[model samples]
Target: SMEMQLTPFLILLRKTLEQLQEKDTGNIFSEPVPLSEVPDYLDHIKKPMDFFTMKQNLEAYRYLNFDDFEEDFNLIVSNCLKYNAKDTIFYRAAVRLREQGGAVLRQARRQAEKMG
Candidate 1:
């Protein structure tokens, strides 16, 4: 029930999809970008995918858009803890990737807007 809210199953599936896609492209999260810089990061990828990336994406967006939302931010942290329950490094990496991806996303959005 609660899992529905967290969308654990969907996230798991998305992570699986990312793994499949990575076979073609190198580390997708290594790039640096943010939401303001690129609002379309989530749009280009196929809808309804990416467990690890999705988590990072939301965290990055929230940090950029809702820095003042401390309570919510804490919740995000807690969620990360839960997501990476088995591995401590996973938690840190997730946070790092979130910021990095957000930056790349931001730049991509800017370029896209210019083209349009």
Candidate 2:
């Protein structure tokens, strides 16, 4: 069940990583690495998530902690932007959070309060 459900997300994550690896640049042997090899090229060539760990955590998303949820959310946003998949991904996330009762909403309210 998890495998079947997570396949699409995993594929997208893999592709995003590949794109970043090729689209960005890093230093190699004291010189700038190829642009195609850097994903966060605009930022700082940050490392991408490890495939196995991302797969493991995403497969068990229902049990994720709040911080992990935040990380995953940001990761989803960044990758989705690269592929123009943000709308559907965020829509599904909203639906899933709604289905999970109201804890996420409460958390968001609290976070907003802290920010404001």
Candidate 3:
């Protein structure tokens, strides 16, 4: 797709990202988890994902479409649920993301459909 056409979806994606970063729960997913703080995290969660990483890829033009962006967002939330215990705030946030983000993604897709 042309750069002109792609900008709309890109803007929507970044906007959604910004919304997810604005809370206490969002703080943990904002950046890479410090490995020195907990080496054992690598044992269960083999791969890592974060909103910061997604932003990097978004800027670099790595995402082909909203679905690509959706994948990393899924990983970001999924990784948190996998690593954190049920009693922690992280798990609760993950649950909320699945509900909120899941719906927003569909709306973004519908919005993009009109733009294209």
Candidate 4:
């Protein structure tokens, strides 16, 4: 069996930004909500949930992570700064407030705080 090394194609900033821009649903949840207000929680939030997660964990903060977990973490924090009530899911099952995700985001923030 032969294994071939694969390189990912270039991710153009304009294209990537366009995709991210398109994702702006203006708070898809319809109403703002805090992570603590979330019911089901952010248990699924992690560094490697997918491409988006990885990117989120990469550019948000600065750390020793070759994967740049700090960067990703920071991005999540910056997002929290703009949080509102609409982001909260009305019912426990009807929404994803991301409790667990918020935890990680907070952890990263603590790390960033120490930088002061």
Candidate 5:
């Protein structure tokens, strides 16, 4: 089918994930925030995101489009900052990772635009 068209897109996204994983606080997003560990975590975050879940979906090609992947990426940082609050460790990490991810996304978009 036309699935192969997104192969390049997926590859870049995978690299993005790898770079994030190696960065500081990347481990925070590596797994779901435990409710027991942080009581009422679910109360603050209506939707959750984690690297494991994200990778699982990526492996199965579950994302229907590039925007879907971005949505997932956005949710990860958003949830972290939302639950952790400003001036907190998680908040700082979330902001840093968000900028890093943005840098990658911009590069990816530029590459895709070259085809136009």
Candidate 6:
């Protein structure tokens, strides 16, 4: 069940990253720079999911959702609180990611309806 929810969330996260990359001319390198160095990327991307990692993965990327996934989203936040991830960047990114997803989805729906 979790995997099913995560798959498309990852797709939207990648799309969100692409949108961010597109706005900045400095991202011409074709490889994303670290959040530490790039002001373009989200700050929470740098945090460790388990308080341990060689390179940070945006694990929180899996937690975001559209309004339809409110149950799952609350579960994610609850887990974060349990694990002391509440004060971390991942928590903040979860909210930001949800907001961005809502905006992107709304725009796409509007465009599709316009084309109809």
TM values, all candidates: 0.32, 0.24, 0.83, 0.24, 0.80, 0.30
lDDT for residue 60 in candidate 2, whole number 0-100: 61
Predicted structure 5, TM vs. truth: 0.80
Using lDDT, give the best candidate's number: 3
The candidate that achieves the highest TM-score relative to the unseen native structure: 3
Q: Give the per-residue lDDT digits (tens) of candidate 4, residues 4-116.
A: 12111112222332343233344433222335665433443332122244444234432232224434433443343333244443323122334434444455445444433
**Residue-level lDDT tens digits of model 6 in 1-116:** 33345655555545544553343233222233334655644333332222111012334443343433333323333433443356766456445544544565566445333322
C-alpha local distance difference test of each model:
0.39, 0.39, 0.79, 0.34, 0.76, 0.39
Off by over 4 Å in 6: 1-17, 20-84
Clashing pairs in 3: none
Model 5 / residue 74 / CA error / Å:
0.8
lDDT of 1 by residue, 21-81 (tens): 3432334332332447657644542232233444466445432222222233233334444
TM-score of model 3 (CA atoms): 0.83
Reference-based TM-score, model 1: 0.32
Clashes of each: 13, 7, 0, 19, 0, 0
Candidate 3 C-alpha lDDT tens digits along 1-116: 44547777788878877766654255678887788997888897877878898889989989867778888888878888989999998899888878877777777778766766
For model 5, what is the alpha-carbon lDDT of residue 75? 92
Candidate number that wins on lDDT, 5 or 6: 5
State the weakest 10-residue window (summed lDDT) of model 4: 1-10
